[PDB]
Structure formats: C-alpha cells, structure tokens
C-alpha cells in the first residue's frame, strides 16, 4: 500500500504544516501536525476543556462506531517550545493521504496548553519519529508509520515541504519526480529516539564550505533551524546590522536586508537553502527588525534540522530494519 497527502502551511510564514487526517467512522477530518521530532498522534477532542478550545476542529469518539477506549492508557507530552498536552486514549481507523491503520492509538487531550488554543488551524500533532519515544503509559504506542511499515510497498515515508506553498507527504513510496539529482542517504542514530543524523558541515553565501561534524535531528515539528553557536555566529556575521537580541530571544536582523543562503552537507552533497526561506518576518507588526530563521541550539542540548532546512530538500525518511535519511535537492 501507499499514501500520498498534501501538506499546507499554517500561516504567510510557514510556521508549521497541516496535513488532513481522517479518523473514525464515518470519517472525522482533522489537520494535524506531521512531526518527525516526536511519537504521538493525539487531537482536540470532545474531552478537551471547553476553554482551552478555540476554533479547532474536535474529533468525538462517541460518534465513531470503530473508536475504543483503550482502557486506563492516559498520556502526556512535553514539547521543545515548552507547549504541552495530556488526556487519554482511543484506538480507530486513522487514513492519510488513502492509507489505512486500523487499530491505531489516537490519543485525545483534556488539557492542552495556551499556545495550542491560540492556534485555531492545528487540531493535533502526528508524530513520525521512533515509537520508543511515545509517551502513552502504562502501555506504549506505535506510531502511524511504525503500524503501517509492514504493509507499505517500501518502509519508507517522505517529506516535502514547501516554501510559502503546499508541499507532500508521501508513504510507502519515492516519487522520482519530486527532486532532481540523486538523493543521498546517510546514517541514522535511534539511540535518542529522533532521526538523527550528522551533517559533513556548512557554507554561508557563496563562502567556502566548512567541514565539520554537526549532530542533529530531523524535526518536521520545529519552524526554525537550530545549529551551534559558532555556525550561527558566522551566518549573522554576513548580514549588517544582525545581532542576537536577549529581549527578543535571538537573532534579528533588518527587514531591509538581503539574506545569504545557507548551505549543509549531507555526505559529499550540498543542501541550499536560500536566503528568504530563513526570514521570519517583523518581530512585532509594523517593525522593522525581523525575525532570523537560523538560530543558536546552545541551551538546547541538540541541533535541529527543523523546516528552515527540511523544506529546501525532498527528505527520505527510511525505516529499513537499519534506518537512514536521505536528502535530495528539488
């Protein structure tokens, strides 16, 4: 089997992705948030506290004649923004993009925190990282991709995330027209749950590229790209009048600037990501100091190859018994 769904950014500045996903029977459409950063598959609910809703879309398992309560699994997640959720659990269908789980963990929030409910165009999170990460206790959960990998032509899934533009998420299968070149893989740790991977190093512009090790993961959940301080330090350097501002909580720069691209290595191949896609935009409306797209991981405790990065590339995400990631320029 495969899947093929379109993913839509959320707002003018990619912030994040929604991808439609039918659950239950009959079907309940909600636009979740593909997460290759995490493990759960959980959503708005009918059992979300009524003030913590705001414009979400709720799925209700009372109306799915497939939905079960998996009886005393509760969950509860923490995110690397300190945004969080937490409820119980149901299992159902779960479609995307024509491909169907039967029996999958859809785990539905009581509580969610102040940034979910005022984001009116996410009902949930699907996780797309490793399975040992997912937080549903006193039994653990599968995710979407690790229930469906048998039955897929290819364990595979991909991410194609667009700039300012609908994008795919495709399962089972590589569409060999989605890129150009080859796509070049490299070595996966699960050791932490991510799909962490080292990068060979980094150009600025049209500088000469830098050889170096950069450990991080690849995170379809997180905006920005988050990369040690030095790196950072030698991006900025190249835009006057960038500077990292405490108050604001990084680097800003004048929206009056052109930005250098941003090159990282995956082996001997070179991922470009032009300038515009790392500006975020005002940092409050009407300024006109902007939001920078790459920023500093110190603090972190990991780099992260969040969409800044992911969407100048078709990304392979291979869940072969070993797991690999490959990259392609498009």
């Known amino acids: 089997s495969t899947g093929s769904a379109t993913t839509t950014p959320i707002d003018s500045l990619d912030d994040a992705y929604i991808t439609p996903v039918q659950i239950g029977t009959p079907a309940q459409t909600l636009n979740l ?8 598959l959980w959503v708005f609910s009918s059992e979300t506290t009524a003030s913590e809703v705001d414009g979400q879309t709720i799925y209700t398992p009372s109306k799915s004649t497939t939905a079960k309560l998996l009886s005393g699994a509760t969950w509860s997640i923490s995110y690397g923004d300190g945004s969080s959720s937490s409820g119980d ?3 159902d269908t779960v479609s995307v993009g024509g491909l ?6 859809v785990e539905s929030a009581k509580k969610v925190s102040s940034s979910f409910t005022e984001d009116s165009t ?31 032509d290819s364990p595979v899934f991909t991410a194609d995330l667009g700039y ?11 569409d060999t027209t989605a890129y150009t070149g080859s796509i070049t893989y490299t070595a996966v740790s699960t050791k932490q749950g991510f799909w962490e991977w080292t990068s060979t190093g980094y150009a600025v512009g049209s500088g000469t590229f830098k050889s170096t090790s950069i450990d991080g993961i690849a995170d379809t959940g997180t905006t920005l790209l988050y990369l040690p301080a ?3 330090s030698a991006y900025w ?36 990501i032009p300038g515009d896609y790392i500006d975020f935009g005002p940092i409050s409306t009407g300024s006109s100091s902007c939001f920078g797209g790459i920023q500093s991981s110190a603090g972190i405790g990991i780099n992260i190859f969040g969409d800044v990065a992911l969407k100048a590339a078709f990304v392979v995400f291979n869940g072969a018994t ?8 498009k």
């Open 122 to 152: 996410i009902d949930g999170l699907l996780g797309l990282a490793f399975s040992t990460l997912n937080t549903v206790s006193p039994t653990q959960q599968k995710t979407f991709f690790d229930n469906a990998k048998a039955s897929l």
């Open 230 to 232: 030095t790196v950072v």
């Open 164 to 174: 300012h533009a609908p994008g795919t998420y495709n399962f089972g299968f590589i």
């Open 237 to 272: 350097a190249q835009v006057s009048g960038a500077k990292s501002s405490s108050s604001v909580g990084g680097y800003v720069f004048p929206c009056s600037a052109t930005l250098p691209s941003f090159t990282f290595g995956v082996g001997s191949a070179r991922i470009v």
């Open 100 to 105: 169907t789980v039967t029996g999958q963990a």
């Open 89 to 91: 659990v149901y299992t």
């Open 33 to 40: 948030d593909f997460d290759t950063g995490s493990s759960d």
């Open 322 to 329: 070993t797991p690999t990631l490959g990259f392609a320029s």
